[PDB]
Amino acid sequence: KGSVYTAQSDVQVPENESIKLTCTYSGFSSPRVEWKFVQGSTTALVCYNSQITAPYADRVTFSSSGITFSSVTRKDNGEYTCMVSEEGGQNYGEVSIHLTVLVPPSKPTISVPSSVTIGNRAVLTCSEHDGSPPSEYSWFKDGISMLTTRAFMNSSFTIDPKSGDLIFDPVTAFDSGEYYCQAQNGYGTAMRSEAAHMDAVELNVGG
């Protein structure tokens, strides 16, 4: 019959740069090429009847071998599906391409409670929302990297690299110290946050 394929189904490209989403096909004579963009629940047509649609006409150019973006932004992340059909609908084929627009992580912020009551729970947060793909996190206490393997077994802590949560349950006097974190996503350079000190006392905090 007729096949439809792509050179790269997982495309990564820095923000603001040009990129061509390729879609090759063979076995067609009078093909109708269409493209759709899926992000979450939103479904938009980029190309209809071999023609770039209105909302994309200002930066997307059509060609029989794929669509070229003169520039992409983080808002373009998602999957693009190239749909090729022989005029009449007898022969059909399609191929999906996931686009990831690269953006290095921004300086993350941290939430470290100045005072916590020993025996209770304490969650220190670390995050940034600009990185693409999403950043992973790591923590430090008084300059020591908490995981390299734990920096010390003397604490009942847990760290979730994906959310960035540093969890102390229960918190002990030993957990008192200066903490800061860093975010990285394999692109650009890792960024560190500001440091913050946490004091662990014996009685209830907050009066």
Ligand SMILES: [Mg+2]
């Ligand atoms: Mg913002």
